[PDB]
Amino acid sequence: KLKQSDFPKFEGSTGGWLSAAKNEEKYVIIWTSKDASLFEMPTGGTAKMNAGNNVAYFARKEQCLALGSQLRGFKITNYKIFRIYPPLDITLLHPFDGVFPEKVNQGRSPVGKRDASIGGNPNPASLKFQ
Amino acid sequence: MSLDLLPSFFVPLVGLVLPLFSIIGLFLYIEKEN
Amino acid sequence: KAERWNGRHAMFGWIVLLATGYAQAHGLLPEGGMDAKEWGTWVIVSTTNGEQVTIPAARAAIAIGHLHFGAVGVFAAYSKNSVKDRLLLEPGEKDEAPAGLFPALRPGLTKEAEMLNGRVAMLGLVALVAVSAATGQDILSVIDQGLGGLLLK
Amino acid sequence: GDFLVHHAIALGLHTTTLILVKGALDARGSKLMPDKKDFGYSFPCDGPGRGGTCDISAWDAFYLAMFWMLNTIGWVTFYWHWKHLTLWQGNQVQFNESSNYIMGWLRDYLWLNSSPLINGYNPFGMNSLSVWAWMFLFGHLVWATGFMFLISWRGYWQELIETIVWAHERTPLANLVRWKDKPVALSIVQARLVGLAHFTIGYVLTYAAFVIASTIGKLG
Amino acid sequence: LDGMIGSSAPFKNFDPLGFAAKADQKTLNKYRESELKHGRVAMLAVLGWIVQEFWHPLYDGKLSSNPLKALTEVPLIGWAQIFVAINVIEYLQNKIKELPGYRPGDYLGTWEWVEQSDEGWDSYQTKELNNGRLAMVAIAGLIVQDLITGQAALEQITAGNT
Amino acid sequence: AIDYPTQLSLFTHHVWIGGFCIVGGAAHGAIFFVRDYNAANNYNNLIDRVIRHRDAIISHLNWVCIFLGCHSFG
Amino acid sequence: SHTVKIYDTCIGCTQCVRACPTDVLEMVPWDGCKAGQIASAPRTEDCVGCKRCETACPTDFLSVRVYLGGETTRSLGLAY
Amino acid sequence: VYKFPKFSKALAEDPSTRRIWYGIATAHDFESHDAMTESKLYQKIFASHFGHIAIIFLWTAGNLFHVAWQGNF
Amino acid sequence: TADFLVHHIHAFTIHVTVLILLKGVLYSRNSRLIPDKANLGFRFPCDGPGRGGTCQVSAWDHVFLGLFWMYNSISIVIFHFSWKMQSDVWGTVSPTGAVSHITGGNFAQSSITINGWLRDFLWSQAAQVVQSYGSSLSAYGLIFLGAHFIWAFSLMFLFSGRGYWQELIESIVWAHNKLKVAPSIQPRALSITQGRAVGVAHYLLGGIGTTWAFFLARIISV
Amino acid sequence: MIYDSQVYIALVIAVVASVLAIRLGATLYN
Amino acid sequence: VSFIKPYRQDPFVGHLATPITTSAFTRAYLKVLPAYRPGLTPLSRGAEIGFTHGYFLIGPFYTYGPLRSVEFSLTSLAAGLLAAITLLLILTVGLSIYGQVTYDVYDNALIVKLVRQMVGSERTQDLPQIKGTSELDTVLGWQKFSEGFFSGGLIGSIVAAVGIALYSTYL
Ligand code: CLA
Ligand code: CLA
Ligand code: CLA
Ligand code: CLA
Ligand SMILES: CCCCCCCC(=O)OCC(=C\C=C\C(C)=C\C=C\C=C(C)\C=C\C=C(/C)C=C=C1C(C)(C)C[C@H](OC(C)=O)C[C@@]1(C)O)/C=C/[C@@]12O[C@]1(C)C[C@@H](O)CC2(C)C
Ligand SMILES: CC(/C=C/C=C(C)/C=C/[C@@]12O[C@]1(C)C[C@@H](O)CC2(C)C)=C\C=C\C=C(C)\C=C\C=C(C)\C=C\[C@@]12O[C@]1(C)C[C@@H](O)CC2(C)C
Ligand SMILES: CC(/C=C/C=C(C)/C=C/[C@@]12O[C@]1(C)C[C@@H](O)CC2(C)C)=C\C=C\C=C(C)\C=C\C=C(C)\C=C\[C@@]12O[C@]1(C)C[C@@H](O)CC2(C)C
Ligand SMILES: CC1=C(C/C=C(\C)CCC[C@H](C)CCC[C@H](C)CCCC(C)C)C(=O)c2ccccc2C1=O
Fold it and tell me: Which of C3, C71, H31, K33 has its CA 20 to 30 A from that of E104?
């Protein structure tokens, strides 16, 4: 019926990925479920989970993350999202250090932090012809 | 060739040929790569 | 490449000018003007007082012949992979080397012969236009004078 | 009538000046956006929170004041043209009496002098004013296309474009042809500019056609 | 006369003359193709016979409502186009016949979706076959009656030439 | 029938009411879809299958609208 | 890609991180506030510019600021 | 898709049709162009002024010629 | 042929209204733009300036545009009815049986062009409305003008945005605070959705009232 | 009525002004 | 039974296997068309497409042009033929520029394998990537396709003009 046994029991929708997620990048979300719960696809309609390993492919990181946020309502937490380039170039994305970004984990450095409030930003006229 | 034949010689020329070549050049230019 | 193509066209056009003079002299080249009722108002040239002067039918026929030749040229242009000599240079192709002041004196059906004859024909067209503009006669009148009278006879 | 229309002109000038001066002074920041200078002269907005933030840039003040400039110039030119049409035709009493109320304007300037223009071509024939009637309708059409670009905003046109993209990508005999630039809806600022351009071009064309054709067809 | 579709209650596996008891699978596929084509053509022919009799809007009226008479009144250049269209359709059917998994009368390729056919699918195929058989008998009767009597269906019925 | 103002007013009023009520029906269908629609209770039914191919419906309706507008208005 | 900056007015309430739809922001250790945490923007290449992050900011004039910049198929939210 | 907005690399990397639209509407905003100095700004504005005055004079010459040729002056 | 064109105009307008409303209903829960549009509710202004701009993605913003297009369709329908009836049904019958209509059969030949609709219908039958002053139908002219005013008033809400009105209210509030008369209930500009609702309500009221006054004055005078 | 020579030389001078325009256009860079 | 299933057992494609996308009739009909017919060089595909397209393109121009005639007129036929030929020229110009800006390949179905085997550590989009393996997806292939379209369009337009004249004269 389906290419892989771990795919959710989805009947296919004309809202899945397109030619872009065959030559630029595609995103895969994996998770393990205790029950074959019925959930709503980020793209189309209702799909059925597998009582075990579940693997879904999407065209955007936002679609995979919306599916994962939906999974949290099913008490599912072990979901992990990967980015796949045109060949099998798998990169773990969402649980980057194994801890969700909302929980503080040691080993993270601040990126994009300014040691002042908004009012300390430089005047644009001094950020010209230079 | 009289002077009154100049409109019939030029108006089609300008108003049709110049759009065609200008479109060709502009499309080629804006679709270039590096 | 451009010089060679323009020389070929100039030689063919010297032939065409001779043919046009012959046709005008020998009763060919249809008479009158185009039918505005048949071909719309775009063939009307002027309205002096209640009569519509239209494009001469001879001019229309000559334009149709030139359209035939120009269409042949356009086909050859968009037929680059099947023609012996292309119109434009391929990426990589390099322009044949200029012939110089005097191309090599190689008689026959040679590149130098065609080159020299094309230059001569283009210079002849330049001289013909210059003579017509300076003196003030028709192009065919200048050709007739330059052939003694054997064209418009 | 001159008194009332001059006060209307003063109102138009003051409101256009208000919009432009407010945009100029509030360009560097306000209470809703105390760092507006960091976003430049022309930016779409600041977002959907804190209340909202539509048309907050200084460019948007110009964009809004263009409508008021067009309205003020329309009032000025309407006044001038009606006064001079009555002066040339000789019925200056028509202006002096009917110019004090709005229906007087609508009936005796627009409705009255639009008769020669609209009959530039009828189911019976046409005149040398036919081009002016065509330009009249053309200006109305461009004006309403501007209305399109101004009332309907983005987001509604991005999803439709996505549907069109899917249709092109999933149809045979047309899959052979694909775009090099991904078709997307016009940006918010670009959409405002395009709607303003349509509005202004239609405005100018329809009024030029009306004034010229009305003068020609009324005064011989 | 097999597990083939088309066996109905009145006469199950109706092969009284034993045409199928000796034929192989290829000959039986040919027989099913012929039966289905005849049935479809006959359904179209019966519907056209009746409708033409009581409605012929095309050809600015004219084209006498009696069939087998309008057969010799069509401009004969419209006959050629109908012939060519039928020919192109059957060329396409021939091309279909070499597709893998082809079934005798199946030109829609239902074998692609219908694996492990149901009873509803078999019943609908039998319905099509039985309607085609009834239409074959009906069109044969129509042509014979119009030949011997000279009147059309609703004309002979209306007068009472029964 | 001979009271033309009455006929014109009745027709226009009833057509206006009809258009408003139709737009309201569409609005409340959308409201039901947003609020009261349960995906689990509508597995593979008509509502589910319509959402599953909404693209096709909307794209073909777009093409029909362009065709009809182009033709009539042009 | 858009630019996201964090300012020391951060109170570490995590509402920005749990509102990001594309996992751009994360909470990192800090010593400038009671919570001992500050938001970070280490994955701005996935930033879409929806500005949900600063709609959930409780600080007075924001501690996370999104500056829209160059566009990308990721930042434009293009599924095609 | 790598050489129309020569003055802006940020636009030239746009994969959408927005690059073409914004390339037109930012062509004369010289102060916002890539690799921009004040000297180049004033020099380009000066040359653009010259071209503009040339356009104005050509427009007036065209009006004069068309009145002389097809008018009834 | 005149009825063919107007009937296909009706079909086209109805199809576009159906398109807007069905797109609103089907894409009310999710889309490729916003995969969680159902979590934003039925009535919300947008999701943000991102994704190139996500204005009016709601389903309410589709009932707003569909209201506009329903106005367009119904206006064309009632215009067709009025002109066709006045031109080819209504009128008087002479004692010998000669039929003379209100307009005189101009629908067949002059309803096939937009200039015809503008001149022989709008301009021609608007004569009774504009010449109603001083008569018992003057209320129809007044309502004509007022409906024009309201329809034009709608465009302020339809074309503008909140940032501008909120920032103008800021200066007005500054003046009030300077005069110690700032209300305790802080004045805020109408929300984006409410701005759209006010715009569409005023647009519908103005257009329908203009057509109402025009139809009533015209059909009562003649 | 202007002559053919008058119009012709004006056209020729216009061509020269065109070659000067592209030189300015190309000098203002691609 | 169900007649709609996910396309090629992939429930995540933006496509469906309906009785129209993947029906045997659709398969055969699209495989007999010149664009997909096996055994055709790109020049032959272009020639057939151009012939058919000019043949049906001369029709509307001759019938409804600005110089129509309820009777048969040589001027009307010439006008329709010229309009059809010029439209074919415009279409050929579009084909030429599209092929110029789309592909950079001279021999396909190999370069993909070469870069999948011998590595493609270059500027990509010519060695790697490469959408489609058809011979129509090359610079040479599309050029010959456009040439065939143009020549076949001229020939088909002339043939259709001759047929129209014969039908209007001898019938
Ligand atoms: C300055 C602008 C301009 C000019 C000069 C023209 C000129 C023309 N238009 Mg046109 N048009 C324009 C802009 C312009 N258009 C725009 C912007 C639009 C869209 C709003 C239209 C929409 C339009 C329509 C809808 C129609 C025209 C038509 C025509 C023709 C007039 C009818 C007639 O009697 O010819 C009769 C025409 C012929 C006898 C044959 C002409 C065929 C082409 C034009 C000849 C070109 C020769 C060319 C050099 C061949 C190249 C070589 C090739 C063989 C390889 C004429 C050629 C009509 C027409 O003829 O349609 C084709 C017509 O139906 N136009
Ligand atoms: C007069 C103003 C005007 C016009 C012309 C349109 C036109 C259109 N709107 Mg609309 N719209 C308007 C005002 C207008 N709107 C306003 C004020 C609003 C605000 C509420 C909207 C809101 C709106 C929405 C929400 C939607 C539309 C849609 C549509 C399209 C329907 C499909 C169609 O008919 O395309 C055909 C195009 C036309 C009929 C326009 C004229 C084209 C001419 C007649 C034929 C072609 C001319 C030719 C190409 C010219 C070439 C020469 C040129 C290059 C020089 C169409 C483009 C829908 C859409 O996207 O399309 C499906 C849609 O969903 N509009
Ligand atoms: C075997 C089938 C068949 C044949 C040979 C004819 C033959 C004829 N019909 Mg006819 N007809 C048929 C079936 C048939 N009909 C059916 C089923 C109907 C009901 C819709 C009609 C309704 C009909 C009318 C109303 C008229 C005719 C008329 C005629 C005559 C002129 C041709 C014409 O205009 O056809 C017109 C045919 C149609 C309008 C409908 C044809 C629809 C076809 C049969 C279905 C699709 C065929 C498809 C291309 C192939 C199938 C695909 C797939 C199964 C492989 C001609 C004698 C005309 C006449 O002069 O009457 C005396 C006329 O006015 N027919
Ligand atoms: C900016 C000035 C201007 C403008 C707007 C026009 C406008 C027009 N001219 Mg014209 N003309 C002009 C100057 C101008 N002229 C000058 C200076 C000359 C003397 C050489 C002529 C000689 C001329 C002739 C001989 C004819 C026209 C004709 C026409 C009409 C059709 C267009 C055409 O065939 O152009 C053709 C124009 C030329 C061959 C001359 C070039 C025009 C100037 C020099 C270029 C101006 C460029 C402008 C500043 C910006 C260019 C933008 C570009 C990059 C897109 C149109 C009304 C035709 C006409 O009357 O039809 C009824 C016609 O037959 N013109
Ligand atoms: C202009 C003439 C002036 C005369 C005055 C009056 C005449 C007139 O009016 O003419 C106009 C006219 C007819 C003109 C007909 C013409 C020019 C036909 C020309 C056809 C050219 C062809 C086939 C070229 C083929 C070239 C090729 C293949 C070229 C090539 C090669 C080769 C050979 C090197 C091989 C290479 O091989 C490889 C490697 O590919 C490929 C290639 C491309 O390189 C009729 C006019 C009127 O009928 C009308 C209109 C109205 C009537 O009432 C009155 C008349 C009769 C007068
Ligand atoms: C191309 C040409 C003639 C082409 C003629 C053709 C195609 C023939 C066409 C015809 O057949 C048709 C189509 C149809 C027939 O019915 C009509 C004709 C007409 C018969 C003449 C060019 C003629 C070209 C000429 C004369 C060029 C002269 C250039 C000079 C002097 C340049 C000098 C400099 O380059 C230096 C030396 C140093 C530089 O630094 C400075 C300068 C000064 C720029
Ligand atoms: C070459 C030429 C024509 C060549 C024609 C060819 C090849 C035709 C080939 C054909 O295949 C076609 C095409 C078609 C076939 O059906 C016919 C044939 C025949 C088979 C004309 C030259 C024509 C050449 C001409 C007219 C030259 C004129 C030169 C002049 C006036 C010179 C003046 C000066 O020399 C002085 C006087 C003093 C100097 O100091 C200054 C200057 C100015 C240089
Ligand atoms: C003017 C305007 C405002 C400001 C409008 C406000 C604050 C409304 C003020 C309403 C007053 C306070 C009450 C109504 C007073 C009327 C006289 C009562 C109505 C008349 C009766 C006859 C019904 C917005 O908030 C807005 C938001 C989004 C898009 C466009 C706009 C917009 O155009």
Answer: K33
